[PDB]
Ligand binder design. Structure first.
Ligand SMILES: [Mg+2]
Ligand SMILES: [Mg+2]
Ligand SMILES: [Mg+2]
Ligand SMILES: [Mg+2]
Ligand SMILES: [Mg+2]
Ligand SMILES: [Mg+2]
Ligand SMILES: [Mg+2]
Ligand SMILES: [Mg+2]
Ligand SMILES: [Mg+2]
Ligand SMILES: [Mg+2]
Ligand SMILES: [Mg+2]
Ligand SMILES: [Mg+2]
Ligand SMILES: [Mg+2]
Ligand SMILES: [Mg+2]
Ligand SMILES: [Mg+2]
Ligand SMILES: [Mg+2]
Ligand SMILES: [Mg+2]
Ligand SMILES: [Mg+2]
Ligand SMILES: [Mg+2]
Ligand SMILES: [Mg+2]
Ligand SMILES: [Mg+2]
Ligand SMILES: [Mg+2]
Ligand SMILES: [Mg+2]
Ligand SMILES: [Mg+2]
Ligand SMILES: [Mg+2]
Ligand SMILES: [Mg+2]
Ligand SMILES: [Mg+2]
Ligand SMILES: [Zn+2]
Lengths: 71, 64
RNA sequence: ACCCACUCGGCACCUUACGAGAAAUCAAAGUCUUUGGGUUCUGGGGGGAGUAUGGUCGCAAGGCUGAAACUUAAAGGAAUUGACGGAAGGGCACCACCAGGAGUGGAGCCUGCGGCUUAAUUUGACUCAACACGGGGAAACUCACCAGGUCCAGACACAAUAAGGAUUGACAGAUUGAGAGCUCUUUCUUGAUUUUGUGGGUGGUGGUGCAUGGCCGUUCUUAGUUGGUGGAGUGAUUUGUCUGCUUAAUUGCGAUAACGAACGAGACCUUAACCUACUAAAUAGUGGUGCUAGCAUUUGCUGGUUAUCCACUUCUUAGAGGGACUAUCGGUUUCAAGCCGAUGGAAGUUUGAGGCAAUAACAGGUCUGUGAUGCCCUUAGACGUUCUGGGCCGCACGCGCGCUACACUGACGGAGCCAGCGAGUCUAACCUUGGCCGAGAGGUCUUGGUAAUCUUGUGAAACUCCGUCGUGCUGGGGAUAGAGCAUUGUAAUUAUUGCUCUUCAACGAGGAAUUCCUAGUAAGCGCAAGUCAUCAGCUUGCGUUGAUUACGUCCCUGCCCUUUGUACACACC
């Protein structure tokens, strides 16, 4: 046939990072708990899921993307 | 045509370790038994076989 | 000298074979396991090798005598069937010729193959039997090629990671051809579905048609194949199955150690022909009747009217039958098979044309039709797959199937106006009548049709009629090119197709060559179907108009069949 070429730079994939996430949550000295990151007002994700914080940006990931609530 | 009426054909590829062989089988069914068809080959010309005659016996005639 | 009978002794030939042989054959090669008349000579698997050595003869060349080591499972004989032959003899055929027809070959373009060119210009196939073939008419698809971008749709087993998250997804931005979270920035989300590693699978239009199945082409426009009982041969084998004659045919007659049969050919089946006979039909038609138009009037003539009724089955349709068997007679011939002629006949060329088609052969083609397939390759920076764009069409040229022509048997313009095989729309946009608009292409409103019911009488084209042109590359010819309008499609640029105007080439009948063809055939002519969203200069069929010339031959070519040679049998590659 011919076999092989390439200008190098082979592509990777993804990582899904790591983290130990949901520390985001704050309970005062015994034991009242206050939520960090405001939740989601779409009835497909009953306020359990959260909005990420970028710029302008507050974003429901559970909604695989959908809707842009910005406050 | 008698082909169509009488001989059954089939091919079947049997698929063994080495390669594959075809099987071809051909059965010719007795045209005699044919039931709902021609009862014989278009070749088949039977003659019906006469009968010994004991002739003469000068005229005469019977009455009823 | 000659003739006839005889007899010795010669050179031979003939037929037989009691007999002999492995056979071919042999009056000796006979009188041999029923083995002995006398006598000479030579041989003991093949190769080494008539070699080396000695001896001896010779002027010489060489002669006579004449080993071994080693190597080796066959060399060899006669006959059989084949296969082959650049032998001989017979045949068969418009993919052979004869007599001709229409041409191809020359031209323009269409189209395939080569070649070159190319990022790629995917590839198979190369005499008949590769080259308008792969149903191959590729704008995406198809698609295999090239430039790049995604996805796993990586079964299953184990192991590893891991509920403190194994893994999944993504908005905007960046990025990208791209409103692909491909990747990256950011940081939510998902919850044991994956991920990683190994084994093991899987896909592939990757290889191999020289590993296969299946199909298919070719031999083959052919006539060959085999068994029963009998004849021959130790035998494999032969004879039957053949000189001749006849036929398209191993089709028959005949001759005959053969007789009588089977596969194949024929029969058979399908289609085109003929039925005033049979059963019928408002999805086929005819006559009469009304309702009715026109013209003529003296009754007439020419239409209208999916039912206003009566009847019929010639025409149309398709069930069942019939019909032809080369019949009658006559010529010819082994007076056999047949063949030829005349009359009759719907039909008398296998009635015309096809469908089927024995045994065998080929390294024919096809892994690129197949979720038919062996093995090899490859398998996540994929040869899997999908997405974007280009490519198969790229152009100094060689070749092949075609298309349109060079005109006056014509072009052009009116006008008459006639076929047949088809095909058509459900969970849908197929075939299209009719009315408008538009020069045209087309549009738009409706409409019948799942169809003998509607398109459609498919009013097709050649063709026939009256004109214009008048031999001038002309009003023949329409290549090449411009400008516009339209249809298909997500997409038309490298111009899908259609129309309008203009532009107006080559070509004045084509060198050597070479194709196809014998009657509703050739040729001319259009249509339908396949393909298909759009595109036929292609093909599969169809019908219309309708000839000239054979009705012979073996000269060329091709292939059969004998004879024959063979040291070939993997069979002349
Ligand atoms: Mg003998
Ligand atoms: Mg011999
Ligand atoms: Mg000739
Ligand atoms: Mg000529
Ligand atoms: Mg593509
Ligand atoms: Mg794996
Ligand atoms: Mg592996
Ligand atoms: Mg495959
Ligand atoms: Mg082959
Ligand atoms: Mg094959
Ligand atoms: Mg090959
Ligand atoms: Mg012929
Ligand atoms: Mg015997
Ligand atoms: Mg013979
Ligand atoms: Mg009738
Ligand atoms: Mg006549
Ligand atoms: Mg080959
Ligand atoms: Mg195949
Ligand atoms: Mg091509
Ligand atoms: Mg061809
Ligand atoms: Mg005209
Ligand atoms: Mg207009
Ligand atoms: Mg001109
Ligand atoms: Mg013209
Ligand atoms: Mg068409
Ligand atoms: Mg084609
Ligand atoms: Mg021989
Ligand atoms: Zn949400």
């Amino acid at each position: 046939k011919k076999v092989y070429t390439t200008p190098k730079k082979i592509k990777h994939k993804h990582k899904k990072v790591k983290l130990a996430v949901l520390s985001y949550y704050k309970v005062d000295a015994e034991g009242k708990v206050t939520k960090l990151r405001r939740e989601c007002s779409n009835p497909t994700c009953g306020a359990g899921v959260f909005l990420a914080n970028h710029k302008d940006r507050l974003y429901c990931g559970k909604c695989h993307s959908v809707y842009k609530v910005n406050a | 045509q008698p082909v169509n009426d009488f001989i059954d054909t089939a091919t079947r590829h049997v698929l063994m370790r080495q390669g594959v062989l075809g099987i071809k089988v051909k059965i010719m069914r007795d045209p005699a038994k044919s039931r709902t068809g021609p009862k014989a080959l278009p070749d088949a010309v039977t003659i019906i076989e006469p009968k010994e005659e004991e002739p003469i016996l000068a005229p005469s005639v019977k009455d009823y």
